[PDB]
Design a protein around this ligand. Structure first.
Ligand SMILES: CCCCCCCCCCCCCCCCCC(=O)O[C@H](COC(=O)CCCCCC)COP(=O)(O)OCCN
Ligand SMILES: CC(C)CCC[C@@H](C)[C@H]1CC[C@H]2[C@@H]3CC=C4C[C@@H](OC(=O)CCC(=O)O)CC[C@]4(C)[C@H]3CC[C@]12C
Ligand SMILES: Cc1cccc(COc2ccccc2C(=O)N(CCCN)Cc2cccs2)c1
Ligand SMILES: CCCCCCCCCCC
Ligand SMILES: CCCCCCCCCCC
Ligand SMILES: CCCCCCCCCCC
Ligand SMILES: CCCCCCCCCCC
Ligand code: NA
Ligand code: NA
Ligand code: NA
Ligand code: NA
Lengths: 833, 108, 50, 100, 49
């Protein structure tokens, strides 16, 4: 729709006050009305990165606004960036106008264009990044007389830097006449420009062709205003590597900023020029006190310059002193994206955990109003700052802990389906913090194990309120828990103070004979009995041994005993069931109404509440309910044995088979549910066909459920589709049987069961450490892993060997060596003349 | 197949052991419900083991949780059957049985 | 599991079809061996299936 | 099956147009999702008379449809105007009690 | 998506890095550099004769 045009033969105020904003940058593309322009894949990429740079910095792009070649391509990339701001101001047998430039200002036109861009270079700006002065860059890529005087009237009149590149007619000439000092090279303009564009010279006079030598040689009077985008730069970020190096040349060669090292820094920080700021600013010949490196640091954090945050820290900057109380609150509401904070609302409400509630409250108390480094780390983790958060992680104190808390915080924010691009990136970043915490902890465990396991259970000083183990189970970090350091820790927490090298049977035979513990039979690590009978392998072995002897005594009570009076056997049957209930109520904490959602732990409570009702029917003294108190004991005897069968089932397949099992358990429960649905519908069909048509009660609703199980434990033409029922009901129920068989397969497999073997054993170790009959009777290590982190960061940094075998340093280290041989060849010719 | 077999042999022996445990508990429940309440000997301890195999070779509200036993005892015993089937899979596979084929033949 | 299922559904339907073919041939063999040798109707073609 | 050399080449060229349409659409879905899903159901101005989704099911283009952009589109077409972040049980208990 | 296609064609075109690491340009860019050194060796012999 839009596009403004002004016929023209003082100007700048009629477009910054009436129309639009201010310029942090200003690019000049000069080709002129070249009706042909060979757009390669390279030149299509150079002038597409350039408009993205002008989109980022907010520049004006002055060019000739006619619909030909580059200037129609520059215009159509501008509307591509307004589809996915850029102000492409245009100034111009006959050319047609370009319908893609934002403002039009239409040979005869290249004087008002110069005297405008020479005025914007003249300005003084109180924002003052480039010493004020509004950075002007002039590109050049093609040939002709017009683009030659455009480089002239830029460089000669004022100081805008000019960038050329080696693909074109005369921009390849000046790309060849800059790697040469020949005392201005008075006729090498003729020795160039003819052998690389031979048809333009035989179209005009000699006195103007020599004027082109006068044109070119006054460009080269200042080679600090001439950057060349060379051809071998086959990579991204080479336009901004040339624009910033052109702006750094024109700024630093003002002969006024010798005391102004900071203005060179903020320029080289806005562009991502790390390898230029390291060797031209931080070289210890320049005098800085590392005290004014703080406002430059706060800009390196908010604009996401991760390589500059790392450079400021390794040149001396105490990040603990820098992160004051108000810098964190100029960072959590000023520089916090609201799309993440809106996504932080949905994660806190829909998938709520204990870590998120600390994170949601610590985001809030900074946007409403002490571990400062671990607040900057969460700030750069929530916003998916991929490489800034890797710099702050290396400065934290609890580094294995914060690598797991970040890996949990991202894994919860990637459970939100509000945007699967942000939820796909943060899941990917969480999978490389869990990997970051594996290989840091295997570095900690390759040192002494007593310190690395001191670190697993560190009290966190309220990081999230949990140690590294608790923060890894809730994140379901299967790679952190399947590592051999954590598995060795759990197998020592389960074997207890008994050594794991004694034997397996040697522990069991000490239960049946107590005086074998006091000898040198077991090789544990004065009253070793309180150490033997507190290890949860012995507590589990005694509880199963007690539970079998409880079932062999409940079998004697049921058959031989139980005449009419609850004699001395049946009273202690309450007391053994009472400690099977007293431990359940003391484990009835931490349930959340989801502990009973597994059909083997609600079965435990429903086996006692179906047994307590057997003590109710016991103490009624009538034969009509004494026998009803026996059939509810005999039915409950099978429930107590299936729990023993389930204990033997889990404790034998506690390994690689614990994933196949307990997935097949809920797959057979679904088949038995579908079989119960079919037996109900078979019961209605069998009751509706047979007799007693209308003679009914609530007899029916209690028989139809059970009549097919009593059936388990007129043929006119309907008998043939009765078989088609038994060819359909057999098919849909056998498929549910085979889905139960093979459903464990479909759906890295070592870390799946090692997480489950960890999660089940730590669930049992979180019970009481005393056996069944006796339930009624009841910053020095953070400094160590800071050493272990620096040893680890050396490992991953010197793994750049297959990138060191990429010889891009060796492809160019002999270019300096062949030019060392080149220049000595030339000067020895000058002596013998 | 010498790794699949003899791993499935000790996996079916565990299922038959758990089935024998369940048939013992089914025998106590069937003997305790039926008659001959207090008229006993060592007749009981030798019959309860065998009465369910002779069974293999008042409904007030307890009959519905009797089916929930046959929906639990079927579940925990069929899982032990399928663990016996598929337990050979979980756990370079050519050198596992070539060691066992060597170890059995050198044992003979 | 939606690929394992509905591939096993048409694989059990083929087994139940082959089982129905075998039960038909078992019905002819059991009817031809037992009595009522030549005393027949369309009683036979509706019983041998069942 | 008239010539399995020409039928082996055109199957190979079809498998790299489906791949050409996966990685173009994941580029479209790494930008805003409301425009990429505007594009899945484009009325084609009679290209073949069908959108990108209808032209991918009949081709059995399993790689175009298993990509996370198309799976996220369908899980929004199935959850409807309900957000997928509510809960699973939270939707069901509103059927039994309309004022929730 | 015409904008989204041109962003995509940039991705697959600049994936020629393992073919750029094939140094067939670098095997011949020094042949012009060694011949730059070669011809200057020959003409300096012609001056001292
Ligand atoms: C009615 C009351 C019925 C009473 C039942 C009688 C019980 C008889 C004793 C059988 C023990 C059950 C075996 C469970 C099991 O296999 O778990 C086994 C234990 O195996 C052994 O201890 C070796 C010899 C056991 C022989 C015991 C006499 C699991 O072994 P483990 O814990 O080392 O490995 C776990 C991960 N695979
Ligand atoms: C007639 C009765 C009283 C004598 C038979 C005694 C057994 C019924 C008891 C004593 C030894 C017990 C076992 C001791 C060692 C094993 C293996 C153990 O599993 C592991 O060691 C896994 C390692 C880990 O979890 O890290 C779990 C308990 C279990 C099955 C116990 C289950 C029941 C057992 C066999
Ligand atoms: C009927 C009934 C009701 C309550 C308690 C019991 C006694 O149960 C045990 C006996 C011996 C050892 C451990 C237990 C025992 O508590 N487990 C079973 C352990 C193996 N899955 C419960 C659980 C622990 C971890 C997850 S589940 C029996
Ligand atoms: C790990 C093997 C354990 C064998 C059982 C020990 C003997 C138990 C019975 C002792 C009376
Ligand atoms: C009409 C009954 C057809 C026979 C059913 C055989 C099913 C066998 C299931 C074994 C897993
Ligand atoms: C209550 C009995 C339900 C039927 C049990 C079917 C089990 C089939 C096992 C075949 C491997
Ligand atoms: C996804 C879990 C849904 C649970 C069922 C909700 C309750 C249904 C019964 C309400 C009377
Ligand atoms: Na059936
Ligand atoms: Na069946
Ligand atoms: Na059974
Ligand atoms: Na069974």
């Amino acid at each position: 729709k839009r596009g403004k045009y002004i016929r023209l033969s003082t100007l700048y105020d009629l477009m910054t006050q009436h129309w639009h904003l201010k310029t942090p940058n200003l690019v000049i593309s000069v080709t002129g009305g070249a009706k042909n322009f060979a757009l390669k894949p390279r030149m299509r990429k150079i002038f597409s990165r350039l408009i993205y740079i002008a989109q980022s910095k907010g520049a004006w792009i002055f060019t000739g606004g006619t619909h030909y070649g580059l200037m129609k391509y520059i215009g159509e990339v501008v509307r591509d960036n307004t589809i996915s701001n850029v102000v492409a101001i245009g100034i111009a047998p006959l050319y047609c106008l370009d319908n893609n430039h934002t403002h039009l200002l239409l040979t005869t036109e290249a004087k008002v264009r110069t005297q405008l861009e020479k005025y914007i270079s003249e300005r003084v700006i109180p924002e003052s990044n480039y010493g004020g002065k509004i950075p002007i860059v002039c590109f050049a890529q093609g040939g002709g007389k017009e683009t030659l005087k455009s480089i002239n009237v830029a460089i000669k009149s004022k100081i805008p830097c000019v960038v050329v590149e080696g693909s074109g007619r005369i921009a390849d000439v000046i790309a060849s006449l800059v790697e040469a000092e020949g005392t201005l090279a008075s006729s090498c303009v003729k020795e160039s420009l003819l052998r690389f564009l031979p048809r333009t010279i035989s179209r005009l006079s000699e006195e103007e062709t020599e004027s082109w030598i006068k044109w070119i040689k006054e460009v080269l009077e200042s080679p600090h205003l001439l950057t060349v985008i060379k051809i071998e730069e086959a990579g991204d970020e080479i336009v901004s590597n040339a624009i910033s190096f052109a702006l750094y040349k024109a700024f630093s060669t003002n002969e006024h900023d010798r005391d102004n090292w900071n203005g060179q820094l903020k320029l080289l920080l806005e562009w991502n020029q790390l390898d230029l700021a390291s060797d031209e600013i931080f070289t210890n010949d320049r005098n800085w006190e590392s005290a004014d490196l703080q406002d430059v640091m706060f800009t390196a954090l908010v604009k996401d310059r991760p390589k500059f945050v790392r450079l400021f820290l390794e040149n001396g900057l105490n990040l603990r002193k820098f992160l004051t109380t108000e810098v964190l609150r100029e960072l959590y509401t000023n520089n916090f994206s609201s799309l993440v904070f809106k996504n932080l609302q949905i994660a806190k409400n829909s998938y709520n955990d204990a870590l998120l509630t600390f994170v949601w409250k610590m985001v809030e108390d900074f946007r409403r109003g002490r571990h400062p480094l671990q607040a900057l780390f969460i700030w750069s983790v929530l916003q998916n700052k991929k490489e800034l958060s890797k710099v702050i992680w290396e400065q934290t104190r609890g580094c294995t802990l914060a690598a797991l808390g970040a890996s949990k915080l991202l894994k919860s924010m990637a459970k939100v389906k509000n945007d699967i691009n942000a939820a796909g990136e943060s899941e990917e970043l969480a999978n490389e913090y869990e990997t970051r915490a594996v290989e840091l902890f295997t570095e900690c465990y390759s040192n002494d194990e007593d310190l690395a396991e001191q670190l697993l259970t560190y009290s966190c000083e309220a990081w999230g309120g949990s140690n590294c183990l608790e923060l890894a189970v809730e994140a379901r970090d299967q790679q952190f828990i399947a590592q051999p350091g954590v598995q060795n820790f759990l197998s020592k927490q389960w074997y207890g103070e008994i050594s794991r090298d004694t034997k397996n049977w040697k522990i069991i035979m000490c239960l049946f004979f107590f005086p074998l513990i006091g000898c040198g039979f077991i090789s544990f690590r004065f009253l070793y009995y309180v150490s033997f009978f507190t290890s949860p392998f012995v507590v589990f072995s005694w509880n199963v041994i007690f539970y079998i002897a409880f079932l062999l005594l409940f079998a004697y009570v049921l058959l031989m005993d139980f005449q009419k009076e609850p004699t001395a056997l049946e009273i202690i049957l309450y007391v053994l069931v009472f400690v099977l209930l007293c431990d359940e109520v003391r484990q009835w904490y931490m349930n959340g109404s989801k502990y009973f959602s597994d059909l083997w732990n609600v079965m435990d409570t429903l086996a006692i509440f179906y047994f307590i009702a057997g003590i109710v029917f016991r103490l009624h003294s009538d034969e009509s309910s004494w026998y009803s108190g026996r059939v509810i004991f005999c039915l409950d005897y099978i429930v107590f044995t299936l729990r023993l069968i389930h204990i033997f089932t889990v404790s034998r397949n506690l390994g690689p088979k614990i994933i196949m099992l307990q997935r097949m358990m809920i797959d057979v429960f679904f088949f038995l549910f579908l079989f119960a649905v079919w037996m109900v519908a078979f019961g209605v069909a069998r009751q509706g066909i047979l007799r007693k048509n209308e003679h009914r009660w609530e007899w029916i609703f209690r028989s139809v459920i059970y009549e097919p199980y009593l059936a388990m434990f007129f043929p006119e033409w309907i008998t043939i589709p009765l078989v088609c029922i038994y060819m359909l009901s057999t098919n849909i129920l056998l498929v549910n049987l085979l889905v139960a068989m093979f459903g464990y397969t479909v759906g890295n497999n070592d870390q799946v069961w090692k997480f489950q073997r960890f999660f089940l054993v730590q669930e049992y170790c979180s019970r009481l450490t005393i056996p069944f009959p006796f339930v009624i009777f009841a910053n020095e290590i953070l400094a160590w892993e800071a050493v272990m982190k620096e040893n680890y960061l050396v490992k991953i940094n010197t793994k750049a060997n297959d990138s060191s075998e990429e010889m891009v340093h060796r492809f160019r280290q002999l270019d300096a060596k062949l030019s060392d041989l080149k220049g000595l060849l030339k000067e020895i010719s000058s002596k013998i003349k």
